[PDB]
């Protein structure tokens, strides 16, 4: 079976730049190669067929090239919307096969997170549980740290973090951190603190409520 | 509109079989081969096989030989893929799609979970700051969708209307149960002088839930 391999595994480029994605086939596939673009929370979309044929509708900045065993997708001027996983596949011989994908991200100006904190709902509190939630929204770069404090003391167990994919409009990231405790640990403290560490500030961004 | 409709989700016991459906409309069903593909997170696509709706003619990936069988129903204009002897290796998103150079189209994909575990509806908790006027010119509201199985859930705000400034975070599995949250950001001119309501569906449990965000 023909094996397809893409490079790079991942990268980030600035809007406007030229980007080059490569795809190697373990044996000759002439020009029977397609490129698919799979944006976050979406189904894949055909960009290029027959190695170099722009699918109807595709913006001109996307040009496919190559033959035999080596193939290239070039984006002449990346746009923030071009954020995505790009896949290449050969349709020369059965079974049809695909590379492992290239994750393209967009570089943008550093951006500080909007931090917002939420106490447990009375609904949850009635069940025995208490989740405290903190949204750190639309920042860049992706690297961020969250720290939870209870009456001044860092809490460690019971926290769950999730990060969104990069946003196609503004190129930022968002994160959610939920601290979960029992009802009767929660009531037994007053001050709840969400503490964000990001390269945009030398001091952490703190958000906090009492009660 | 050209459409290839697949069920959102399917939960199935390991060792059992399942019939994935892909229901076609908007074009002449019998004039295009239907391709089935498998997608696991952080993997590339795997091609399962293809079937000609005109006659039922098929081509399979040898790898899926004992695993997948492709059929078609011309009167329902529906393609089906049967998966047998299911194992955890089978849990993945499955897509049907048409691969023509002048006509390339993909279903939404069905999320297959094979698990002995029983289905658990989500708890959904409104996230209010709350109070008022804090802070900047807009407000961030949210919903915590907790303790469910299996994936997926779908979260909308004001039934789709509010698509601006929504962030829905990827579910995380914490102990045989998933949790996710979603936040929305709106000018304080709307809220709370308007309904802001998160809508949550859990296909597997047929759960539908609306939680209005109430101040404080």
Author numbering:
A (entry chain B): 1 to 211
B (entry chain A): 0 to 215
From the reporting publication:
In the present study, we generated a mAb, named G196, against glutathione S-transferase (GST) protein bacterially expressed using the pGEX-2T vector, and determined that the epitope of G196 corresponds to a sequence of five amino acids in the C-terminal extension of the protein encoded by pGEX-2T, and not to GST protein itself. The minimal epitope of the G196 mAb is the five amino acid sequence DLVPR. A Kd value of ~10 nM or less between the anti-tag mAb and the tag is desirable for rapid and robust purification of modest to low abundance proteins of interest, and such levels are common when the proteins are expressed at the endogenous level. It is noteworthy that the Kd between mAb G196 and the G196-tag peptide is 1.25 nM, which is comparable to or higher than the affinity of the anti-FLAG M2 mAb/FLAG-tag interaction (Kd = 3–28 nM, and typically considered high affinity). Furthermore, mAb G196 recognized G196- and GFP-tagged Atf1, as shown by immunofluorescent staining of yeast, comparable to that of a polyclonal anti-GFP antibody. These results indicate that the G196 epitope tag system is suitable for Western blotting, immunoprecipitation, ChIP, and immunofluorescence assay in both yeast and human.
The structure of G196 Fab was determined as the antigen-free form at 2.0 Å resolution using the molecular replacement method. The R and Rfree values of the final model of G196 Fab were 0.191 and 0.228, respectively. Although the structure of G196 Fab shown in this study does not contain the epitope peptide, it nonetheless shows remarkable features of the antigen binding site. Tyr32 and Trp33 in CDR-H1, and Trp99 and Phe103 in CDR-H3, together form a hydrophobic core. Trp99 in complementarity-determining region (CDR)-H3 interacts with His35 in framework region (FR)-H2 through π-π aromatic -stacking and forms hydrophobic core with Tyr32 and Trp33 in CDR-H1, and Phe103 in CDR-H3. Asn31 in CDR-H1, and Asn52 and Asn55 in CDR-H2, are located at the side of the hydrophobic core and are good candidates for recognizing Asp. Leu at position 2 and Val at position 3 of the G196 epitope might be recognized in the region. In particular, Leu can bind through stacking interaction with aromatic residues, given that it can be replaced with His or Phe. Therefore, it is likely that Arg at position 5 is recognized by Tyr102 in CDR-H3 rather than by Asp104. Structural analysis of G196 complexed with the epitope peptide will allow precise elucidation of this antibody’s high affinity recognition mechanism for the epitope.
